[PDB]
Structure 1
């Protein structure tokens, strides 16, 4: 009886195995755009993905992860609210059964169809597993998806999904350029939070871009054909793999923009 996104094992249950689910810096949150304060001291973000080395795509039973070579400083996030250098390890998405839900963060209570998470770890801690035990261990770039025009840079991801339908399947996924998933503007909100999946560790500096990317209905329909189950098991479509907004508690969301 492992955690998941069903009636019996979904987010409202996670606190039993992971009591930090009720902690003081949980994610995601609602971003109240009127209360977020412009912080003139932040920087422009530095997203340096030219030398990114994608390796593989994995259906882990909760999402699919596009994994990178993080054995050296190839694709890194720096600047913005961050001190030091954060190495890209993987990206994945959260999405809904219909276009009116799917994102984890919300903006004035608006839910987007999906949300992309580019996960990076602080190189001062040497490895990902050490990083997640630190309050400044991870930096996650969050990007909302809305349904409209196709995203050209997403189609290579869409077209491999048939090959990783079920939990535990992987495929080679070399030479994928994550720059093709970014919006034009890097304007962002930032706040201290957590992983949005068990173990829900409070180790993340969240950087949530204001500008959504557009994907087509056909693209997100292919996400929804994935399975949470393993091969041969009763089919459970991989949809609604999002955690709802958690209490903000004693946190301030800062804006990079006026």
Structure 2
């Protein structure tokens, strides 16, 4: 029953998911002046050359592109991480207008959207077990600003008309997620949570400093999706972001000076 509306949105989630008021919730505001450069942090290793995308799905909260995670084909390592994390899916959060949509913020600045590339720690064997562990998941977060088009996003944009409503999916093979990355892998990192129910406190967040640019036409296509199922009153899938949560006793570390 949870969603992003007045009666089921983020301010309501704690009733079914009390960890919503926990000690390591996401997203957060990244205060750039307070984040500590950590020279012990390693470069991130993003190994997506053998990625195998499977499907694209409207799940009623976002759209997601799903990958074969049954072998080490597209993996995240290094950075703040110990061990190997397999790419399972990516999805986005976005706004009704360009001045909101991101989940993380940077010195209170909201971006138009935020891409989450979701990975799970192979030492737990499957994602269901990983979400029960404090180091179970690593989510790579990438901000989107509106300007020039992102060519590597266009294949995604062009199939969204086929998954307009909740429950629709389509074949989405041979998609290369490397086409969604910025030039720099400079990042901030902190321990946090899933940003949607069940809000499990299982995520090492890795948020890239450099946004990607997408065009107004690309983000407009996101905003034509629907939260509702076919047949139900049409409610545009916009503003599917959770606001910044209290940092509490956490330190955000920077990979860069």
When normalised by structure 1's length, the TM-score is 0.99
Query: Following the alignment from structure 1 to structure 2, what is the Cα–Cα distance between the partners of residues 159 and 136?
Result: 35
> Which secondary structure does the structure 2 equivalent of 1:11 belong to?
coil
Deviation at 1:117? 0.1
Superposed CA offset, 1:82-140 (max 9, x none): 00000000000000000000000000000000000000000000000000000000000
Superposed CA offset, 1:62-93 (max 9, x none): 00010000000000000000000000000000
Indicate the residue corresponding to 2:129 in structure 1.
130
Q: How many residues align?
A: 257
> Which secondary structure does the structure 1 equivalent of 2:140 belong to?
strand
Query: Following the alignment from structure 2 to structure 1, what is the Cα–Cα distance between the partners of residues 41 and 185?
Result: 13
When normalised by structure 2's length, the TM-score is 1.00
Superposed CA offset, 1:215-255 (max 9, x none): 00000000000000001111000000000000000000000
> Which secondary structure does the structure 2 equivalent of 1:118 belong to?
strand
Indicate the residue corresponding to 1:179 in structure 2.
178
Query: Following the alignment from structure 2 to structure 1, what is the Cα–Cα distance between the partners of residues 53 and 174?
Result: 6
Superposed CA offset, 1:148-178 (max 9, x none): 0000000000000000000000000000000
Deviation at 1:213? 0.0
Query: Following the alignment from structure 1 to structure 2, what is the Cα–Cα distance between the partners of residues 36 and 15?
Result: 28
The Cα RMSD (Å) is 0.2
> Which secondary structure does the structure 2 equivalent of 1:33 belong to?
coil
> Which secondary structure does the structure 2 equivalent of 1:155 belong to?
helix
Query: Following the alignment from structure 1 to structure 2, what is the Cα–Cα distance between the partners of residues 63 and 96?
Result: 12
**Structure 1 unmatched runs, 5+:** none
Deviant stretches of 4+, over 2 Å: none
**Structure 2 unmatched runs, 5+:** none
Query: Following the alignment from structure 1 to structure 2, what is the Cα–Cα distance between the partners of residues 127 and 148?
Result: 38
